[PDB]
Design a protein around this motif. Structure first.
Motif, PDB file in Angstrom:
ATOM      1  N   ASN B   1      -0.575  -6.407  14.367  1.00  0.00           N
ATOM      2  CA  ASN B   1      -0.947  -5.500  13.345  1.00  0.00           C
ATOM      3  C   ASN B   1       0.654  -5.048  12.784  1.00  0.00           C
ATOM      4  N   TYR B   2       0.574  -4.198  11.411  1.00  0.00           N
ATOM      5  CA  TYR B   2       1.807  -3.756  11.036  1.00  0.00           C
ATOM      6  C   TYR B   2       2.389  -3.016  12.005  1.00  0.00           C
ATOM      7  N   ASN B   3       1.852  -1.947  12.579  1.00  0.00           N
ATOM      8  CA  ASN B   3       2.588  -1.048  13.773  1.00  0.00           C
ATOM      9  C   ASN B   3       1.773  -1.339  15.161  1.00  0.00           C
ATOM     10  N   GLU B   4       2.290  -1.869  15.980  1.00  0.00           N
ATOM     11  CA  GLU B   4       1.760  -1.935  17.416  1.00  0.00           C
ATOM     12  C   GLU B   4       2.185  -1.056  18.281  1.00  0.00           C
ATOM     13  N   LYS B   5       1.487   0.217  18.468  1.00  0.00           N
ATOM     14  CA  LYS B   5       1.790   1.451  19.298  1.00  0.00           C
ATOM     15  C   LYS B   5       1.109   1.398  20.676  1.00  0.00           C
ATOM     16  N   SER B   6       1.715   1.997  21.395  1.00  0.00           N
ATOM     17  CA  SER B   6       0.908   2.200  22.829  1.00  0.00           C
ATOM     18  C   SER B   6       0.175   3.117  22.847  1.00  0.00           C
ATOM     19  N   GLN B   7      -1.195   3.048  22.646  1.00  0.00           N
ATOM     20  CA  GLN B   7      -2.261   3.999  23.006  1.00  0.00           C
ATOM     21  C   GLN B   7      -2.855   3.855  24.216  1.00  0.00           C
ATOM     22  N   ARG B   8      -2.701   2.887  25.006  1.00  0.00           N
ATOM     23  CA  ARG B   8      -3.213   2.358  26.185  1.00  0.00           C
ATOM     24  C   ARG B   8      -2.455   2.078  27.488  1.00  0.00           C
ATOM     25  N   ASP B   9      -1.370   1.647  27.508  1.00  0.00           N
ATOM     26  CA  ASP B   9      -0.183   1.961  28.678  1.00  0.00           C
ATOM     27  C   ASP B   9       0.435   3.230  28.600  1.00  0.00           C
TER      28      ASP B   9
END
Lengths: 50, 37, 52, 50, 50, 49, 50, 50
Positions: B1-9
């Motif tokens: 994606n454009y921004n890969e942000k940690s919403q799961r770890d």
């Protein structure tokens, strides 16, 4: 389940031990109420059975 | 994606849970001392 | 007769116990369970299934 | 079912979210009869996405 | 005198003064009360309920 | 760590349950489930006669 | 009875194993039923959730 | 192609053609379906049922 009881099995003793302290309080309070009634009435001397 | 942000770890703080009770507590023991029968 | 060619079988031993009274040392005890019984740990393996 | 991510660890949460349910002129009601709205969908050669 | 405290809900808002022997002996009648305890046991048995 | 971007707080405990059967028409299981830590403030939740 | 079901117990697994194959057939036929509806319906391109 | 046959009464008078990978690997998504087998659990308890 072949695996044995978890440490929670010791909570049966903790539960029991807390109940012991609670019984001491209930006995204390009920004992005081019974004593209040005896001293309220005409019982100011030692005797058996009061 | 454009921004890969940690919403799961996430870090897990693993909250402890340590409880105890003696045969009876100091309040009951001083008032009703224990006698073994 | 019954033939099982290739099947993984998990046979439980069960509770090999007698319901006999067991005395305990109640003088002073404590309990401290962990997250294992819930498997919610291992880095919160429910959202952290993917690390990439 | 999905695990409840926030709350009791034994909750199972269902979140069914679908835009693709189809009601065409070929579908019937639970009665088994295709009538009413479905009949009009059949004659109009239309299908609904719910 | 000595001071002993409880957090039992039943005892909130109370102060009770009771005598005891200055030195506690085993099974001492002169203690205000006594806690007579018989060793607790745990039983472990598969039981069909209902 | 920026790779994580947050924290999860997992609270284990022991719950005290009553011995209660499920109801046929109940809205929810009527079984006072409380944390065992409550027994330190109100030990009466443990009484059983 | 001191003698356990020596070989007859294996019938529990053979019963189970046959049921496993039966589930495969039911799952295949039920899957085809869903697939027929989806491809009969206008889903001729890759999509999620259909 | 390969030919696989059953005598399951549910699958009677049907021919279904499905792809699979020519060389089957473990947990290969390219198989038409998968059968996820954990275990068969055998348990023995003297239950007083009734």
């Amino acid at each position: 389940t072949d695996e044995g009881p978890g440490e929670v099995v010791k909570a049966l003793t903790v539960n029991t031990n807390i109940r012991n302290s609670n019984n001491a309080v209930k006995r204390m309070l009920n004992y005081l109420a019974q004593l209040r009634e005896v001293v309220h009435n005409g019982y100011n001397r030692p005797k058996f059975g009061i | 994606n454009y921004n890969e942000k940690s919403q799961r770890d996430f870090r897990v703080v693993t909250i402890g849970y340590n409880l105890a009770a003696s045969r009876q507590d100091e309040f009951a023991e001083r008032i009703y001392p224990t006698t073994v029968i | 007769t019954n033939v099982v060619t290739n099947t993984p079988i998990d046979v439980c031993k069960g509770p090999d116990v007698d319901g006999t009274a067991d005395k305990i040392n109640d003088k002073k005890i404590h309990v401290s369970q962990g997250l294992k019984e819930f498997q919610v740990a291992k880095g919160d393996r429910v959202e952290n299934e993917i690390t990439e | 079912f999905q695990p409840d991510l926030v709350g009791d660890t034994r909750n199972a949460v269902i979140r069914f979210d679908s835009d693709d349910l189809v009601v065409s002129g070929d579908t019937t009601f639970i009665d088994g009869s295709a009538d009413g709205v479905i009949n009009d969908l059949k004659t109009a050669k239309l299908s609904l996405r719910l | 005198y000595d001071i002993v405290s409880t957090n039992n809900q039943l005892f909130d808002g109370k102060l009770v003064v009771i005598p005891t022997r200055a030195v506690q002996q085993e099974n001492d009648i002169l203690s205000w009360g006594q806690f007579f305890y018989v060793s607790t046991v745990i039983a472990d048995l598969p039981i069909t309920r209902g | 760590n920026p790779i994580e971007g947050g924290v999860v707080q997992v609270l284990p405990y022991i719950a005290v349950m009553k011995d209660v059967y499920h109801e046929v028409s109940g809205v929810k299981m009527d079984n006072e489930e409380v944390n065992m830590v409550e027994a330190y403030r109100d030990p009466s939740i443990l009484d059983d006669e």
